[PDB]
Every structure is written in C-alpha cells, then in structure tokens.
Design a protein around this ligand. Structure first.
Ligand SMILES: Nc1nc2c(ncn2[C@@H]2O[C@H](COP(=O)(O)OP(=O)(O)OP(=O)(O)O)[C@@H](O)[C@H]2O)c(=O)[nH]1
Ligand SMILES: Nc1nc2c(ncn2[C@@H]2O[C@H](COP(=O)(O)OP(=O)(O)OP(=O)(O)O)[C@@H](O)[C@H]2O)c(=O)[nH]1
Ligand SMILES: COc1cc(C(=O)c2c[nH]c(-c3cccc4[nH]ccc34)n2)cc(OC)c1OC
Ligand SMILES: [Ca+2]
Ligand SMILES: [Mg+2]
Lengths: 66, 440, 421
C-alpha cells in the first residue's frame, strides 16, 4: 500500500510535467511555423515588387533604343 | 493566504477591470489613494480582502492585478484616472500598436513582442504571494488582443505555473456593440486555443447585458460604461466569496467542484438579480423568494440561451446581504414545484448555497438601485451550448467563402488552424449533447 | 500616436488634397498659420494622425505635395492654407506628363520618384507608430495616375507592413475630353488592384451627375465637383481624426471592409447633398453615391456608415437595422453583421446632421465596365499607342492591365452570385 501511494503521487507529477512539456513544445512549434509563414509572405511580396523594378528598367532600356 | 491575481487583457478586459476594482474599493472601504482606515494591520495582513489586495508599508492597498493592452489609449485613462494611485506603473503594460481586430496579430505578430515583459510583471505579483491560488483573466472574444494575446498568455501561464487554476471572464460578442466583422473568427480561435488551459470560464454575452440595461435599467442605448457597471456587480458577486468571509460563505473553489463534471464542460451560466432602477426599487423591497425566482427567468441571464430546453448538471446560488438559510430553503422549495428544472440523471439535484452578509454596493452615479439583498446563480446547463452554436454558425457562413481569412494568413496563420479550431468547437457542441443524454 | 502620411500627386490630387486640408483644419480648429483656435479638446485628441506638432504649438500637415508640373506648386502656395505646408515637402519637376501614363510611371516620373521618397522617409521615420499612407490623385492624367502608382509601388517596397489607402478620381467624358484617359485609368487600376489595401473610387461621372441633376448646376466647375469630394473625404476620415467608441484606423478599416484582398474598391456616399430616417434613406440612395453605380444592381459585401451631429443614437440604430431588413437582398447573407454604424458628435461646417457611406458593393463593376468599354474602343484601333510604346512600354502590358481589370469585374460578379446555402 505504501508502494501504491508512491506511484500515485509520481503519476500526478509525471502528468503535470508532461502537460507543461507538451504545451511548451506545441507553442514553440506554433510560433516558429508562424514566423516562417509570415516571413515567406513578406518575401514573396518584395519579390513581386522587385520584379516590377526589373520590368521598369527594361522599359527604359527599350526607349533608350530611340 | 490564497491570493488571486487578476489579468485584464485588451480594451474590454481593461475597462471591465476599471469597474470591478472601483467596486471592490467601495465594498472594502478603500479610498482612491489606496488607504483603508479600517485596516489596522499596516503593511500586511491575512484578511479576506488580502486575496485581492496587497499592502505597502505606507498603508496603500494595491490590487493584485496586471493590465495589458497592445495600444495605450485605454490604459492611459487608468494612468490618469480617478484610481491612478491605486496601481504601481509596472502593473499597467501597453504597447504602441494594437492587434487591429486580428487574432493572429494579438497572438503572433504584435503579441510576441510583449509577452515576456507581461510574464515578468505577473511573476513580480506572484512572488508577493505566500499561497498563490490562481489567476482571473478578463478579456473579450472578439478583439484581436482579447482573443489572440489572451490565448498566448494562457498557454504561457500553463507552462510557467503548472496546473495552478486559471479562471476566465470572457466577453461574448454582440452586434449591438460589435467592433469587427471577424469577431466570430477571433472567438472560435481563442476558445479552441484556451480550452485546455482554462479551468472555468464565465461567459458574458454583451447582448444579454445590453438587453438587461435596456429592459431593467430603462437605458435607451447602453454604452460600455452602462454594460460594465452591471458586469462588475456580477463579477463582484462571484468573487465575493474570495474577498469576504463568514460562517455561511462558500468558497468559489467549492462551487467549481460542483460546476465542472468534465474538464471541457467548464462554462457556467450566470444569472443575477435584482437589476432594478432606483425609481422602481423605492418602497418596493424584493424578498429572498423574489430574487431567487428571478434567477430562473432567462431574461436575467448573462448569456442568451434557454435552460428550460436543456438539462442541469449543477445549480449554485451565491447570496449577498440580508439573507438567512430558512428563507433560501423555502424559496428553493417553491421554485422546484413551479419551474422547469430538469437535471441529468447522473447528477444530484440539490442546490449549493453560499451567503455573504455584506449587502451589495453601488458606485455613485450609476443606474442600479441600492438593494438589501442580491443573488447570482451559477448553473451548469447544456443550454449554454446555444452560445457556441450561434457563434459557430456565423463562423461557418464566412469561412465557407474564406472571407477575411487572408488577413490571418498574411500574419503567418494557416487555414488548418481555422478548421482545427472549428472541429474542436464541433466536438464541444457534441460534448454538451452527450452529457445531456440519459444513462444506459 | 498613429500617424498617417498624406501624399497628393498631380493637378487633381493636389486640388482635392488642398481642399481636404482646408476642411479638416477648420474641423480641428487649425488656422492657416498652424495655430489652434478651438472650442473642444476633441479637436486635438487625435491630432497626431494628420498633423506634426512643431515647437511653439504649431501644427503642420504631414503632407507631401508632388507633381511633374511646376505650376501646381505655386497655386498650392497661393491658395488658402498654402502657408501651413512644409516647403521642403514640395517636390516638383519641370516636364509635365501631358496625360501620358508611361511618362509618369516609367520615364520622367521615375526620375523624380526618389526625390519624393526622401520626403516620405523624413516624415515616416519621425512617426511614433506609422499607420500607413493616403494618396490623392486622378487616374485619367499622366502624373497622378502614372507616377502616383509608381510611388505606391516604391513606398510598399520600403513599408510592406503599412496600409496603402488611395482616393482615386476616375475619368469621365462628361468632365474631360482627353481621349487617352481610359488607357491611363486601366493601367492605373492594374496597379491599384495589386498594391493598395483600400481605394475610394471617386468617380467624376458621379460627381458631374450630382452637380447637374441633383444640385441643378449646369456647367459644373471643378470647385463644384471638389466640393462633393471634400465633403466625402471629411466624412470617410472622421473616424480616423476624432475619438470614438470604434477607435478607427486604416488597418481596422481594411480588415473589416475587405473580405478578399483584390476587392478593395469602395463606393463612397454622402448625405445630404432633416430627420434621421431621411439621412439613412438618402445615404443608401444611388443618387448619393460618389461612384456611378446602382447598388441595387449588385450586393454589398460590407458597409461602413458614419453619422455626424447631435441626434439620437437609438434612432440611428433603429433606422440602420430597418434599411437592412427592407433591403435584405442587397447585402450578402454569408457575412453576418457586415453593416457597421458610427456616430460623431461634431458635425461638419454648414450642416447640423450629415451621413457618410463607405460601401464595398459588387455593383462597383459598373464603374470598371464603363472604363473597360472606353478602353477597348480605342485599343481595338491601337489609337495613340505610340505615346506609350514611344516611352519604351510594350503593348501587351496593355493586354495585361485590361485582362486584370476584367478579372476584377468577374470576381465581384462571383461573390455577387454566391449564396450561403
Ligand atoms: N462589455 C464590454 N464589452 C466591450 C468593452 N469594450 C469592448 N468590448 C467588446 O469587445 C469586443 C472588441 O474587442 P476589444 O476588447 O475592444 O479589442 P482588444 O481586446 O483591445 O483587441 P484589439 O483588436 O487589438 O483592439 C467587441 O465585441 C466589444 O463589444 C467594454 O468596455 N465592455
Ligand atoms: N474632381 C476633380 N477632378 C479633376 C480635378 N482636376 C483634374 N481632374 C481630373 O483629372 C483628370 C486628369 O488628371 P490631372 O490631375 O489633371 O493630370 P496630372 O495628374 O496633373 O498629370 P499631368 O498633367 O499629365 O502631368 C481629368 O479626367 C480631370 O477630369 C479636380 O480638381 N477635381
Ligand atoms: C463605421 O464607420 C467606420 C468604421 C471604420 C473602421 O475602422 C471599422 C471597424 N470595424 C468596421 C466594420 C465595417 C463593416 C462592418 C462591420 N461590422 C463590425 C465592424 C465593422 N469598420 C472606419 C471608418 O472610417 C475610416 C468608418 O467611417 C465610415
Ligand atoms: Ca492589513
Ligand atoms: Mg483595443
């Protein structure tokens, strides 16, 4: 019965720790995937805007063939 | 000991915090400068009000509270308001840019810049506690900060404070005072993310409060100030057991044992009475029986739903004022014969009663009459799932078209989080249906 | 502080821009010298949004005034309040675009755009917390249209996380005979669809019809048209400039008005051109729309309405709910609570009660169809295309702008036909 008492409180400790651990890990994965998603969204926006700079210089080079 | 730390997040959480803490001070005789002449133990103490107030050596009684908002407009009014001396400046935390009604900005983009500072300031309050009992979190469902930052904070609080209890006061959205079209989105996202991290949540339907103010206080067009004065009375009735003590005072944790049969079923329905104008209350004194009977009128509930068409799992009555058990028992006996009160077959039908003897206080210039006795009913009814059903339907209408979703994806969120959140809500509605079915 | 940086480009942009600063400076009690002469402290509570405070209690508009045409600088300076703008914020060339979009966007305007971006940079970097930018311009000319959209692209490159708002004046043959304006507008709409977050479609066709039919003004001048524009611009910025229960800003407006990124072209409305029932019915009347579109030819995705003056908020709430019920079929069923109402106690000059309307209606396709019809009438004949290929442009860029605008129309039609069930 003493051995069972030990196992009950050890199970209570292990479940509270496991809940903290998995909540800690799920959050870190959520923040990291969100960071790379938002960065990729901003990078795609600038890439399209930078392709507008390449097309603009191309338009000027064509007029320079005046 | 058993201190409680209050956390007020976003405009709704902050402004309701203003109303609650002003009401607390009037209830305990605390002046706007924090001095409490009746308190003879200078610089400390173990009294019931010390669960919500710490004390400085100069005799100031300081709320165990943190105010957080991602923009400074609302908390700036606290910093320059009537009770500015009550709070140490580090208890009032503001950013520069709000979440713009966007859960993703409150949880990820903007919220992540301030979360560590907020947790540091919370730890400062927790370190002043000799027996910290848990947290009370005030926030809206619909705001980007109230939804996004709160759920981020609740996740971090579970990590930093193991399974220490966390209670919510959550403002459920209503069109009459809505601020954003995407409030159903924010509500479902924060309810899903917070569900595992909250032990008990008291939802407050702004439409229910709006209607009570119109119908009972004869207020033509209620403002936030009208709503918050009523809400603070209901919050005070719920926390009264933590801040006062007496021989018939049942602690809130003891009510929670009865109110939460399964961890996910932790949303009690609050019903409060009486809400009466000073002109109506004059010469009309409402008895224990009358205010108790009013607890079973759906018009007095904090969230719109019909418990007459659901089943009860718990019924708690929290009385304050001139109330004795004999009158409570007779009132309950009458109500049971004459009302539609059906319990599930796996729960006892008895009503848990708490009585706090100090009568309700009203803030000067309000619309509520001062009354000799009031009661707040906390019931666990399957009918509260109606609030989820209405919210989930509004979510479905927009999400079927992916309307406004790009504002969330642009902040790094994925559609999978929307559908994962919505599936959790679908399981929650199913849970409430299952608990109501008879045993086999 | 949530600052907005205002930019006005070209003749039309500088004209409606100057009137905007005149109107709101009066509303905030700012005189032409930048000194405050005010009754209420509601006038100064959110004054950061459009004004910088220099030492000495002087308020200077956070405004950048730009044109390839030198004359407009002097006309701005000589106009009322010309003496409030920062002189370093005047950026002008010597060329003039001659209603040539390619000159504004690719050649002469690109030569001047870096000089403007430097002014944008001092102003943006002084900002406590920048909301974003609001540009005034026309789409029918060359500078405001071509250089305006080039500026939008360049600003978005350096401020990709700020809101880009435009007041875009659409061309109409009733006010302008210049032939190539359907080209300039289509090329501009091509840019605006991709690179702005919210665009107010200020339609010269609608402005003319209101002055002629409703106000009975034959031969309406630009002062008559811009009188409607300044009333509109004051109304749709009221919730940015004054403290309200809604506490509006450019991002919150976009989040709530724009369900899909490309469908960000708003129909403004104003009333009166009175009881609260009259205001609400007029505000939803097609005659009061600043875009020549009939709302009953489409459906509202979202609506924002601001009522100004001393009136019963209960009565306003009842009437707004009433027009939604009696016109249910003209609001989409799959966006709940898509009509929002706000109130401001301070009325504009000369009225005790006014109402301003911001609609995201699928009927806006009527505006783009009208421009598409005029565009294709010329493009099928290749008329005056040498003005554009002469600046180095390739002719299928015209193909793409037309195709992109036709896509915008079809997308508005798609959500007009969508149902909840
Ligand atoms: N009862 C009550 N509800 C409020 C109050 N203030 C805001 N709300 C409600 O809260 C919702 C909007 O969320 P807010 O709390 O204002 O937004 P927020 O938390 O500051 O988040 P942001 O988007 O960053 O501003 C709406 O449904 C409002 O009706 C208040 O003082 N009392
Ligand atoms: N409502 C209104 N429209 C105007 C005003 N001024 C010009 N427009 C319209 O603007 C269009 C032409 O654009 P402009 O602004 O005049 O040309 P710009 O932007 O200065 O560019 P360039 O003159 O070619 O260098 C025409 O269709 C006019 O009808 C104005 O003051 N009010
Ligand atoms: C109401 O009027 C205005 C609002 C706003 C605004 O930021 C906002 C926030 N929510 C909303 C909004 C819009 C549409 C449907 C909605 N259902 C719930 C909220 C909401 N709109 C900005 C304005 O002018 C700049 C303005 O004036 C016209
Ligand atoms: Ca003490
Ligand atoms: Mg806020």
């Amino acid at each position: 019965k003493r051995e069972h008492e030990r196992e009950v409180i050890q199970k209570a400790i292990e479940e509270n720790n496991n809940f903290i651990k998995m909540a800690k890990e799920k959050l870190a994965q959520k923040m990291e995937s969100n960071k790379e998603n938002r960065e990729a969204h901003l990078a795609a926006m600038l890439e399209r805007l930078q392709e507008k700079d390449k097309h603009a210089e191309e338009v000027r080079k064509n007029k320079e063939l005046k | 000991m058993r201190e409680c730390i209050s956390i007020h997040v976003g405009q709704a959480g902050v402004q309701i915090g203003n109303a609650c803490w002003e009401l607390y001070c009037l209830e305990h005789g605390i002046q706007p400068d924090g001095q409490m002449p009746s308190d003879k133990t200078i610089g400390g103490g173990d009294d019931s009000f010390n669960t919500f107030f710490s004390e400085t050596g100069a005799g100031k009684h300081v709320p165990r509270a943190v105010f957080v908002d991602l923009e400074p407009t609302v908390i700036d009014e606290v910093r320059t308001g009537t009770y500015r001396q009550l709070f140490h400046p580090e208890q009032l935390i503001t950013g520069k840019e709000d979440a713009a009604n966007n859960y993703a900005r409150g949880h990820y983009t903007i919220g992540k810049e301030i979360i560590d500072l907020v947790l540091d300031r919370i730890r400062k309050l927790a370190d002043q506690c000799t027996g910290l009992q848990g947290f009370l979190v005030f926030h809206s469902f619909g705001g980007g900060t109230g939804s996004g930052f709160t759920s981020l904070l609740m996740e971090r609080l579970s990590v930093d404070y193991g399974k220490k209890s966390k209670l919510e006061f959550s403002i459920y959205p209503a069109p009459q005072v809505s601020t954003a079209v995407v409030e159903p989105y924010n509500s479902i996202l924060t309810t899903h993310t917070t569900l595992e991290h909250s032990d008990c949540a008291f939802m407050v339907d702004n439409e229910a409060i709006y209607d009570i103010c119109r119908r009972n206080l004869d207020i033509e067009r209620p403002t936030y100030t009208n709503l918050n004065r009523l809400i603070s009375q209901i919050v005070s009735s719920i926390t009264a057991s933590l801040r006062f003590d007496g021989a018939l005072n049942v602690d809130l944790t003891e009510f929670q044992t009865n109110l939460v049969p399964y961890p996910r079923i932790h949303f009690p329905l609050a019903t409060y009475a009486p809400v009466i104008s000073a002109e109506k209350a004059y010469h009309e004194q409402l008895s224990v029986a009358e205010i108790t009977n009013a607890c079973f009128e759906p018009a007095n509930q904090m969230v719109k739903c019909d418990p007459r068409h659901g089943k009860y799992m718990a019924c708690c009555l929290l009385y304050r004022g001139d109330v004795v058990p004999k009158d409570v028992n007779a009132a309950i006996a009458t109500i049971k014969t004459k009302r539609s009160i059906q319990f599930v077959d796996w729960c006892p039908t008895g009503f848990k009663v708490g009585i706090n003897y100090q009568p309700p206080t009203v803030v000067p210039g309000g619309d509520l009459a001062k009354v000799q006795r009031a009661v707040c009913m906390l019931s666990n009814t399957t009918a509260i799932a109606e609030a989820w059903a209405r919210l989930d339907h509004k979510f479905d209408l927009m999400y079927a078209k992916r309307a406004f979703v790009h504002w969330y994806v642009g902040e790094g969120m994925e559609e999978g989080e929307f559908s994962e959140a919505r599936e959790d809500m679908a399981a929650l509605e199913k849970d409430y249906e299952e608990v109501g079915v008879d045993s086999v | 502080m949530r600052e907005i940086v205002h930019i006005q480009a070209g003749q039309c942009g500088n004209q409606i821009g100057a009137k905007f600063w005149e109107v709101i400076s009066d509303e905030h009690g700012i005189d032409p010298t930048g000194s405050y002469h005010g009754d209420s402290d509601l006038q100064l509570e959110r004054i950061n949004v459009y004004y910088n405070e220099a030492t000495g209690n002087k308020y200077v508009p956070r405004a950048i005034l730009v044109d390839l045409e030198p004359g407009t600088m002097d006309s701005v300076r000589s106009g009322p309040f010309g003496q409030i703008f920062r002189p370093d914020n005047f950026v002008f060339g010597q060329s003039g675009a001659g209603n040539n979009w390619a000159k504004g966007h690719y050649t002469e305007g690109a030569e001047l755009v870096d000089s403007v971006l430097d002014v944008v940079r001092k102003e943006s970097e002084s900002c406590d917390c920048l909301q974003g930018f609001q540009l005034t311009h026309s789409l029918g000319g060359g500078t405001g249209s071509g250089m305006g959209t080039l500026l939008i692209s360049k600003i978005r490159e350096e401020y990709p996380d700020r809101i880009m708002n435009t007041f875009s004046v659409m061309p109409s043959p009733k006010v302008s005979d210049t032939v190539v304006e359907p080209y300039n507008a289509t090329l501009s709409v091509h840019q605006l669809v991709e690179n702005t977050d919210e665009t107010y479609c200020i339609d010269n066709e609608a402005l003319y019809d209101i002055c002629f039919r409703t106000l009975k003004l034959t031969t309406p001048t630009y002062g008559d048209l811009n009188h409607l524009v300044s009333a509109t611009m004051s109304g749709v910025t009221t919730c940015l400039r004054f403290p309200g229960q809604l506490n509006a800003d450019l991002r919150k407006l976009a989040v709530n008005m724009v369900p899909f990124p490309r469908l960000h072209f708003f129909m403004p409305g104003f009333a009166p051109l009175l009881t609260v029932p009259e205001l609400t019915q007029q505000m939803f009347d097609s005659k009061n729309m600043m875009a020549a579109c009939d709302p009953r030819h489409g459906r509202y995705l979202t609506v924002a309405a601001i009522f100004r003056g001393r009136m019963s908020m209960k009565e306003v709430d009842e009437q707004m709910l009433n027009v939604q019920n009696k016109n249910s079929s003209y609001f989409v069923e799959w966006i709940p609570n898509n009509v929002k109402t706000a109130v401001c106690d301070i009325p504009p000059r000369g009225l005790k009660m006014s109402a301003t309307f911001i609609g995201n209606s699928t009927a806006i396709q009527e505006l783009f169809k009208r421009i598409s019809e005029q565009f294709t009438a010329m493009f099928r004949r290749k008329a005056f295309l040498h003005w554009y290929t002469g600046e180095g442009m390739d002719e299928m860029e015209f193909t793409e702008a037309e195709s992109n605008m036709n896509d915008l129309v079809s997308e508005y039609q798609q959500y007009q036909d969508a149902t909840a069930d």
